[PDB]
Copies of this chain bind each other. A is one copy, B any other.
Amino acid sequence: GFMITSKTKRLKAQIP
C-alpha cells in the first residue's frame, strides 16, 4: 500500500 501523512497534525497512516 501507500502512506499518507498530515504534517500539521504530525500523523501518518498506511492505505492498503
Contact = CB atoms under 8 A, between A and B. Distances in A.
Dominant SS among interface residues on chain A: loop
Number of copies: 2
A10 B8 CA distance: 8
Interface in A1-16: 9-10
2 contacts: A9-B10, A10-B10
A10 B10 CA distance: 8
A7 to B, nearest CB: 8
A5 to B, nearest CB: 13
A9 B10 CA distance: 7
Contacts of A10: 9-10
A9 B9 CA distance: 9
